[PDB]
Amino acid sequence: INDSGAALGYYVSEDGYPGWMPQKWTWIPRELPGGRASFIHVFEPVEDG
């Protein structure tokens, strides 16, 4: 995120099934600039930030 908190993207660790895959973190933006909803991250925040 930025200093203002705007969620830019995410680091997706690699799957762990079977219980012996290592995790590697991959970049995923929250949404495309044109308004396209690529990574739909829906959560209820109890407070700011």
């Binding site: 219980g19 012996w20 895959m21 290592p22």
Partner: protein
């Protein structure tokens, strides 16, 4: 710390002693061995008159019923800091996993553990059927001599009188001595397993070498047993009537290695001699509250929190294997 069920080997390859002479396992819920408790041989002749029947027959009260099983509980670490045994090129990426490294290293650790208890059990077996005496001993533990009762005629010696070394290497036949020692064995002898140089001076006699049959002439499952354990039991062949085997097994002690077998020894007896595997209590709270107080072995994987904050594999057992009939085998030291 992994569960109890992660104890799969399917590797039972003891050298023909605990699997062939000493099948007679008796794990107990009680500490010691109580030979009076074991039925052993049953009072097995008398009938009753054709009017009514007689009294109640019991386990016939073994005279000595108190010896200390060898409660052996070693352990090791499976700390994921090593590179492990890499079987050829099965994807070392899973070794790179701490999960797979830790599970197959507990596999390796525990297998070392039961083969350790197996080799100490084989030393117990070789003491047992070579002198009838076993030394239940260890530091910070009193040495108890556990005696089956091997008789003097079961301990008669070849060096007494005339030695095979001090005989004609060409015309003398040690078969005469073979039945001489076999007669007072309370049965028929069908394996003549030697230690290496013992068989060497046995076969040094010509009569032996043109009396023995090198052919298979497959008599029993002993050939299958040798094919299984092609390591230290060597099926020399047929001596005609009897099978000729040589055991050259070795134990690798604290700093050195040496053979199980003494220099020149022999035990004459049957392949179906009765061997007891009495097992004592297992002193592990897990074992008691899940009922493994009466069993063969107990593994566990477990984490210590605090000063030795680590994780270990622990193996616990308590064997006191003996022979039911010490007179069944005649133990001879050779020339």
């Amino acid at each position: 710390a992994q569960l109890l069920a992660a104890n799969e080997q399917k590797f039972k390859f003891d050298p023909l002693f605990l699997r062939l002479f000493f099948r007679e396992s008796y794990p107990f819920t009680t500490e010691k061995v109580y030979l009076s408790q074991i039925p052993g041989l049953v009072n097995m002749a008398l009938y009753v008159s054709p009017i009514v029947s007689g009294e109640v027959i019991r386990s016939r009260g073994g005279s000595t019923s108190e010896f200390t099983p060898g409660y052996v509980k070693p352990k090791h670490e499976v700390n994921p800091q090593m590179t492990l045994r890499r079987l050829p090129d099965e994807d070392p990426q899973n070794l790179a996993d701490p999960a797979y490294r830790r599970r197959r290293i507990i596999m390796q650790n525990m297998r070392d553990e039961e083969l350790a208890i197996a080799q100490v059990e084989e030393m117990q077996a070789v003491s047992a059927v070579l002198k009838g005496k076993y030394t239940m001993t260890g530091e910070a533990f009193d040495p108890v001599e556990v005696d089956m009762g091997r008789s003097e005629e079961n301990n008669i010696t070849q060096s007494g009188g005339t030695e095979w070394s001090k005989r004609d290497k060409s015309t003398y036949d040690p078969t005469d001595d073979i039945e001489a020692y076999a007669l007072n064995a309370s049965g028929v002898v069908n394996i003549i397993v030697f230690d290496p140089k013992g068989w060497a001076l046995f076969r040094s006699f010509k009569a032996v070498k043109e009396k023995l049959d090198t052919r298979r002439g497959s008599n029993s499952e002993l050939e299958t047993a040798v094919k299984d354990l092609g390591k230290a039991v060597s099926y020399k062949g047929m001596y005609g009537d009897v099978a000729i085997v040589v055991y050259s097994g070795q134990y690798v002690e604290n700093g050195v290695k040496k053979n199980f077998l003494p220099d020149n020894t022999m035990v004459l007896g049957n392949t179906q001699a009765r061997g007891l595997r009495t097992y004592g209590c297992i002193q592990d709270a897990d074992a008691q509250r899940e009922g493994i107080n009466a069993s063969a072995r107990y593994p566990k994987n477990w984490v210590t929190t605090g000063d030795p904050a680590r994780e270990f594999t622990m193996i616990q057992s308590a064997p006191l294997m003996l022979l039911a009939d010490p007179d069944e085998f005649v133990s001879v030291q050779l020339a």
